[PDB]
Design a binder for this molecule. Sequence first.
Ligand SMILES: *[C@@H]1O[C@H](CO[C@@H]2O[C@@H](C)[C@@H](O)[C@@H](O)[C@@H]2O)[C@@H](O[C@@H]2O[C@H](CO)[C@@H](O)[C@H](O)[C@H]2NC(C)=O)[C@H](O[C@@H]2O[C@@H](C)[C@@H](O)[C@@H](O)[C@@H]2O)[C@H]1NC(C)=O
Ligand SMILES: CCCCCCCC/C=C/CCCCCCCC(=O)OC[C@@H](O)COP(=O)(O)OCC[N+](C)(C)C
Ligand SMILES: CCCCCCCCCCC
Ligand SMILES: CCCCCC
Lengths: 99, 273
Amino acid sequence: IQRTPKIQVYSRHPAENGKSNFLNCYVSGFHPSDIEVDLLKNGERIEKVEHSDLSFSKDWSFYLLYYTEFTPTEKDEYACRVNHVTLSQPKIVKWDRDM
Amino acid sequence: RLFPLRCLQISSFANSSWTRTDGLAWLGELQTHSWSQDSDTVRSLKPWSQGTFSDQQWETLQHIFRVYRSSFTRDVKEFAKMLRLSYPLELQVSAGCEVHPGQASNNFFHVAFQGKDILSFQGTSWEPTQEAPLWVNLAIQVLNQDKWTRETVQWLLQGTCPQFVSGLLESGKSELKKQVKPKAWLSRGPSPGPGRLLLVCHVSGFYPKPVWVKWMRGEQEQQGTQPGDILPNADETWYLRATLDVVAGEAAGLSCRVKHSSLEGQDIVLYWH
Ligand SMILES: *[C@@H]1O[C@H](CO[C@@H]2O[C@@H](C)[C@@H](O)[C@@H](O)[C@@H]2O)[C@@H](O[C@@H]2O[C@H](CO)[C@@H](O)[C@H](O)[C@H]2NC(C)=O)[C@H](O[C@@H]2O[C@@H](C)[C@@H](O)[C@@H](O)[C@@H]2O)[C@H]1NC(C)=O
Ligand SMILES: CCCCCCCC/C=C/CCCCCCCC(=O)OC[C@@H](O)COP(=O)(O)OCC[N+](C)(C)C
Ligand SMILES: CCCCCCCCCCC
Ligand SMILES: CCCCCC
């Protein structure tokens, strides 16, 4: 229990409703390595995700890339949910297309 | 620019009985190798990943790593018991080298405990980092007794690695040297006001990593531009967001400017409207 995770959600391309895209979630700067990460669609877990290998940076904190192929729309709300020893409850960060 | 070989290892000891060891290799910013513990094999991630090495040569490295992984593991648990170190343990190792065109070759072998540096292989032996608590010094004394391991590590670093990397560079140069032009878009962020605007600039899909993104009024950089972290895409290109917290009236005439090596001097300029 040292460093708590940063969570950043973003897309590969500018969101255009009804067009194919990729939603990325980058979890970084956490320690120790034990972590749980999920991409969310309207609150529900996305099963067809892909992730990268656990890695770390010069300062020894760990990072992880999650991503899934998706199509944005007016209605659908996408998010990234993380759980870690440094958190008292899983943290959720919402994809904001205009941010 | 430079394309160092970074060999990463993540060994997690939860208790005396449960441990997990995984590794990867990065050449420059490209991940070339994967080593899972649910596999007694080192997976190559690019067709040029094996460099100029035979399968005989390569297949031995396969076996030498397994012996390493287990030796390291029991050695750690043993240090833990001697030095009364409490579980769980987070050991990390960052080792490799980088080849210089075309004379010398520098190398490095760093190990961290619980996310903090403790020791490294400097010259023909192990040295503790200056901060290191004193138990690390006892560990150094033990480690430095093993002249066999020393010479081995020194050989890998000063000999094998450089030789290996040179191969990788020859075979993968084309992919390393590639340039990928980014695309940029504008958007309105969460109101810092009212009555304010958060001007957000998106730059995504660029390679390699070094980029330049600033909000501008003509040729005047906006001291106030706040760039975010450079984030990775699944396709080995990056993503960067730059914001400006401004009075709504200021937005008019403001532009977002992207400078990247792939653009060949032709900056991307997006105007706020
Ligand atoms: C060593 O640790 C095992 C649990 O590993 C955990 O993994 C994550 C879940 C996280 O908690 C991490 O920090 C821990 O290290 C202990 O218990 C169990 O191992 C079994 C394997 O089948 C598995 O169900 C779980 O990982 C865990 N079960 C639980 C707690 O529900 C081991 O402790 C015990 O060993 C047995 C002799 C027995 O005491 C039993 O209670 C546990 O298996 C630890 N290893 C040993 C052998 O001491
Ligand atoms: C909790 C505190 C941890 C501090 C310790 C951090 C140590 C970081 C240094 C790691 C270097 C490698 C340590 C593993 C031991 C040897 C590593 C290695 O690269 O060689 C393996 C070799 O040790 C094979 O097994 P062996 O049984 O020990 O011997 C083989 C050599 N002989 C016997 C042929 C001479
Ligand atoms: C040749 C690439 C294989 C790298 C695997 C990770 C090893 C990290 C530990 C280095 C001693
Ligand atoms: C010990 C780092 C270099 C390994 C080359 C295969």
